[PDB]
């Protein structure tokens, strides 16, 4: 069974006294007419918990707070017995559902006791109220504040909540309210600011009474349903295969230095392979190598052996290291090598290969069945530069799909922004990339792949207005969305993400589109009267036979 939070959940947010004033204050609060849970048990503590108990003779006893409360770490406790409250943060072995018959501590239906809790800035906050009730199994419709009683400067991590013997429990939410203070300083009334458009009007005007008129209160923004990115082409990669396969392998005597520039690096090809014999990159991670841009890539096809494979690298010296290729102290590069002798050598012996010895090259005559410790393996290492020239050795660019006729966040080759895309009759020039308005803003773009001209329109936006007769007379309000098509208004004001008091006007049986915008909440009539609440474009609204009507003045 669930209960509606009738005008409940109000507590003093600040230790300040105010007489005859309204104060629009923002903090965590339990919404007006929100849903609370009844129980007859472990619960979470998302931000705060509003707790109520409706019993006859103090049957309820205590509570257990904390995160897991298994005594494996900190766990707060609150206990009560014979008009005495014992409070602690000590760690006893807490039972699964404890019942009755150290960094700090403390000591001390017929009646309704209310408890609301929270934690901010490493402190424990309690606001409480005791109310005289005598009725059964319901939440009385009444307004009363919660009074701050205790503070515990613990700063314990609390996410779990327990009760020990009505179990009305409700969570606190970050909502703004318009408090009302009387002369005595007691909170006399309050308004949840997201209950309904009338609440919005009260919040803006800072009043509990609003007279006849149209009151523009909230702005209205459509949000991108998703995001898209586009890019010029699939790829113009380098011929990394040419310096990679190396059937006609390089000579170690003069290590082949290859300059690579102006490509889209196939870093993924030998990075996402998982089928490579020798990889070990030092100075740059092997994971995000596919998203980087460098000026000049030097790939050296070098000759290595079974034992000298790791010799030519920072941290190891050796003959191949000393004579042919010597790694520096802070090389920024990777080691890549195909390690097999079935291909590295020929049948009968690869005598043509030579390793520098009088440095002058000693022949690297690997046998056809040469041992692993003597097997040659083509060794390749890539070094990247940052010269006074454009860096063109770059990773491939991921392009998403072109989704049109929706509010989306796009990224067209760095010309980016948020808008709604529509194919245009506008024709560009075969060298043109994007269009521009008189006031120098982006309006039209060319999709890099299909070479079509699209129109970019701002995501729907505008302001909300509330049309209402004086609350002194009536409590019905008609809402007007400005300069928008009626089709997208409910989801654009987040229809699903609103309380039903808002959803009743997010959509409706009476949606009227005017020149000034789309009006919800007043059925249009075909008569004409001396218009009283002016809407715009000749349209005005009033309260008549009863409901609100929209007509031409």
């Amino acid at each position, epitope marked *: 069974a669930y209960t509606n939070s009738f005008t409940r959940g109000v507590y003093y947010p600040d230790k300040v006294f105010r007489s005859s004033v309204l104060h629009s204050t923002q903090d965590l609060f339990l919404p007006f007419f929100s849903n609370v849970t009844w129980f007859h048990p472990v619960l979470p503590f998302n931000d705060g918990v509003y707790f109520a108990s409706t019993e006859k003779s103090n049957i309820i006893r205590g509570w257990i707070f904390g995160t897991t409360l298994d005594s494996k770490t900190q766990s707060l406790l609150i206990v009560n017995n014979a008009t005495n409250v014992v409070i602690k943060v000590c760690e006893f072995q807490f039972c699964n559902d404890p019942f009755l018959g150290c960094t700090f501590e403390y000591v001390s239906f017929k009646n309704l006791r209310e408890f609301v809790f929270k934690n901010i800035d490493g402190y424990f906050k309690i606001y409480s109220k005791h109310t005289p009730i005598n009725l059964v199994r319901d939440l009385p419709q009444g307004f009363s504040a919660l009074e701050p009683l205790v503070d515990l400067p613990i700063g314990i991590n609390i996410t779990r909540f327990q009760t020990l013997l009505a179990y009305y429990v409700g969570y606190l939410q970050p909502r703004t309210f318009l408090l009302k203070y009387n002369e005595n300083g007691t909170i006399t009334d309050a308004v949840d600011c997201a209950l309904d458009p009338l609440s919005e009007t009260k919040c803006t005007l800072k009043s509990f009474t609003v007279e006849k008129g149209i009151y523009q209160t909230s702005n209205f923004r459509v949000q991108p349903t998703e995001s898209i990115v586009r890019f010029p082409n699939i790829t113009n990669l380098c011929p990394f295969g040419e310096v990679f396969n190396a059937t006609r392998f390089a000579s170690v005597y003069a290590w082949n230095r290859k300059r690579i520039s102006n490509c889209v690096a196939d870093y993924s090809v030998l990075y996402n392979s998982a089928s490579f014999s020798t990889f*070990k990159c*030092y100075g740059v991670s092997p*994971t995000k190598l596919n998203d980087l841009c460098f000026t000049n890539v030097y790939a050296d096809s070098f000759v290595i052996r079974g034992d000298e494979v*790791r010799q030519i690298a920072p941290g190891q010296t050796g003959k191949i290291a000393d004579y042919n290729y010597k790694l520096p102290d802070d090389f920024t590069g990777c*080691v890549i090598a195909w390690n097999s002798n079935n291909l590295d050598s020929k049948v009968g012996g690869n005598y043509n290969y030579l390793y520098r010895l009088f440095r002058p090259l000693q022949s690297y005559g690997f046998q056809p069945t040469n041992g*692993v410790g003597y097997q040659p393996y083509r060794v390749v290492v890539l070094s990247f530069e940052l010269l006074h020239a454009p860096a063109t050795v770059c990773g491939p660019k991921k392009s998403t799909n072109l989704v049109k006729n929706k509010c989306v966040n796009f990224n067209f080759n760095g010309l980016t922004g948020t808008g709604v895309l529509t194919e245009s009759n506008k024709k560009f020039l075969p060298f043109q990339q994007f269009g521009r308005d008189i006031a120098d803003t982006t309006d039209a773009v060319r999709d890099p792949q299909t070479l079509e001209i699209l129109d970019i329109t701002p995501c729907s936006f505008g302001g909300v207005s509330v049309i209402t007769p004086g609350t002194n007379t009536s409590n019905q309000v008609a809402v007007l969305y400005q300069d928008v098509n009626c089709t997208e208004v409910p989801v654009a004001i987040h229809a699903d993400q609103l309380t039903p008091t808002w959803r009743v006007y997010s959509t409706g049986s009476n949606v009227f589109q005017t020149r000034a915008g789309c009006l919800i909440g007043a059925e249009h009539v075909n008569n004409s009267y001396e218009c009283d609440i002016p809407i715009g474009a000749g349209i005005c609204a009033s309260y008549q036979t009863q409901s609100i009507i929209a007509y031409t003045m």
Partner: nanobody
Amino acid sequence: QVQLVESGGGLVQAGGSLRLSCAASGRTFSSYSMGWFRQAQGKEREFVATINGNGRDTYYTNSVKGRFTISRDDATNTVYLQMNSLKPEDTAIYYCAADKDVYYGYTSFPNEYEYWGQGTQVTVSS
């Protein structure tokens, strides 16, 4: 002197799952990116697989492609060699070793590890 200590061998037949802890003392540990090796008798020093300091990357050879997975530890400063699907010839002396910290990734030459431990020997009997 670095005492690279190993334990976690087993006499179990195909299917039993065991771990290979490589504990060292007197030296930097969390920063040391260390990978596991073995010395199969009838073969020379060989590479099996490797892990890195943040548990960032892995590289598995084609004889332990699905058999071995690697996962580290933080508090007791140790890396394990997880394993499954034992092979009859797989029994040998298993030597995890240590190498000065690498920026990322792995070096797979069995000589690339310089400080060598004592070893944990798994057993497969066929």
